[PDB]
Amino acid sequence: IVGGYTCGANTVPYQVSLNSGYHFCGGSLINSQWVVSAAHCYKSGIQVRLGEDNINVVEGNEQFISASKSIVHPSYNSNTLNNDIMLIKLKSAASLNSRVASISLPTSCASAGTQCLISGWGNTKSSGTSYPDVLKCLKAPILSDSSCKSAYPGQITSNMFCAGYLEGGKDSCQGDSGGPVVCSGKLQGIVSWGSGCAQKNKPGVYTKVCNYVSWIKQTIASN
Ligand SMILES: N=C(N)c1ccc(/C=N/OCC(=O)O)cc1
Numbered sequence: 363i364v365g366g367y368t369c370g371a372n373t374v375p376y377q378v379s380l381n382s383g384y385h386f387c388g389g390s391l392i393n394s395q396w397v398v399s400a401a402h403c404y405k406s407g408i409q410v411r412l413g414e415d416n417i418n419v420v421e422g423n424e425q426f427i428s429a430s431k432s433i434v435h436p437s438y439n440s441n442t443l444n445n446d447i448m449l450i451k452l453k454s455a456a457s458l459n460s461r462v463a464s465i466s467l468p469t470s471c472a473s474a475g476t477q478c479l480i481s482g483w484g485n486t487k488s489s490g491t492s493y494p495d496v497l498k499c500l501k502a503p504i505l506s507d508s509s510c511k512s513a514y515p516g517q518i519t520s521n522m523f524c525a526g527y528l529e530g531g532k533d534s535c536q537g538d539s540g541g542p543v544v545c546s547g548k549l550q551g552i553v554s555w556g557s558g559c560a561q562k563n564k565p566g567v568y569t570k571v572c573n574y575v576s577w578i579k580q581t582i583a584s585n
C-alpha cells in the first residue's frame with residue numbers, strides 16, 4: 363500500500379496473509395474455512411495466516427492453518443487477468459473472535475463514488491521497494507467505469523473496477539495482491555493489477571467480487 367496508513371493491530375480481522383515460507387499475497391476470510399484471493403496468487407503449499415499484524419513477529423493472536431485445496435476460477439485468464447479470483451480452503455476451521463472474523467459477500471455491486479478500505483503488506487513505495495511488517499490501510503473511492511476504461515484502454519472487462527486516485531500517490535501495490543477492498547462492510551474487490559503503483563492516471567484495478575457470489579457460494583457448498 364502506497365500513501366496509506368498503519369491500520370492498527372487486528373483492526374482488519376478478515377485480512378489474511380498467504381505464506382509459502384514468506385508472505386506472498388493477501389486474502390479475505392469469508393467463513394471459518396474459506397479464503398478469497400486473486401487467481402494470480404495461485405501456488406501449491408499455501409499456509410493461511412490469520413490474526414496477523416506484524417508478519418515477521420509472533421504477537422499472540424495468530425492462527426496458522428495450511429490450505430487443503432485451492433480452486434482457481436474456471437475462466438481465469440492469466441494474460442488479461444479476467445476472472446482474477448481463487449478460493450482457498452483451510453485444513454481446519456479458524457477459531458472466530460473479534461480479531462479473526464469473516465467478511466460478508468456483497469448482495470449487490472457497489473457504485474462509483476463508494477468509499478472503500480483497501481489493505482495489505484505490499485510495497486509502500488511507488489519507485490523502489492520497501493515492505494512494511496505491519497498491515498497498511500488505504501481509504502479510496504471506486505472510480506467510474508468510464509474513467510477506468512479511459513485510464514486503461516482495451517483492458518477493463520466487466521469483471522474489473524478501478525479504485526483510488528487519478529492524481530496518483532495513493533494505491534495498492536505488489537504484495538497487496540489478492541487482498542480485500544471492503545465497502546460498507548462488504549467484500550467488493552480483490553487487489554488484482556495496475557500499471558506500476560500510485561502513478562498518475564493509473565489507478566488500481568480490482569476483481570469485481572459481486573459478479574462471483576453465485577460461483578463462490580456454490581463452490582463452497584460442494585467442496
Ligand atoms: N494497484 C496497483 N497499482 C497494483 C496492484 C497489484 C499489483 C500486483 N502485482 O503483482 C505482483 C505481486 O503482488 O506478487 C500491481 C499493481
Ligand SMILES: [Ca+2]
Nearest residue numbers: 416419420421
Ligand atoms: Ca505476527
